[PDB]
Amino acid sequence: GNLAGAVEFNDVKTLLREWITTISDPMEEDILQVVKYCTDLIEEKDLEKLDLVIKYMKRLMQQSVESVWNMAFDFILDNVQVVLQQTYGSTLKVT
């Protein structure tokens, strides 16, 4: 359940809260890390906690909407939804 080094569910929330608001953040690989985690949690069917991460990343990318984070919102949402169309056949509507 590790995500950006954060092991616990409260840790990933607080750490990715910092990652988005305080960092110069690197190439889109770091966004695709959370996309990979969405795909893994899709295989493992732990989408309970992954929905938590999606809706909180919606919150944060909408609150920190500045160029790369605006683009990261569309990138993160779309990629989770296409893999969720592959497995479940429906798109997760956090909005």
């Binding site: 950006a4 080094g5 750490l15 990652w19 690197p26 190439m27 690989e29 770091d30 890390q33």
Partner: peptide
């Protein structure tokens, strides 16, 4: 300094 590639998310996600 130049680490070649400088991640944050991925860095911690491999460093832990």
């Amino acid at each position: 300094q130049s680490t070649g590639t400088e991640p944050f998310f991925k860095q911690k996600s491999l460093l832990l």
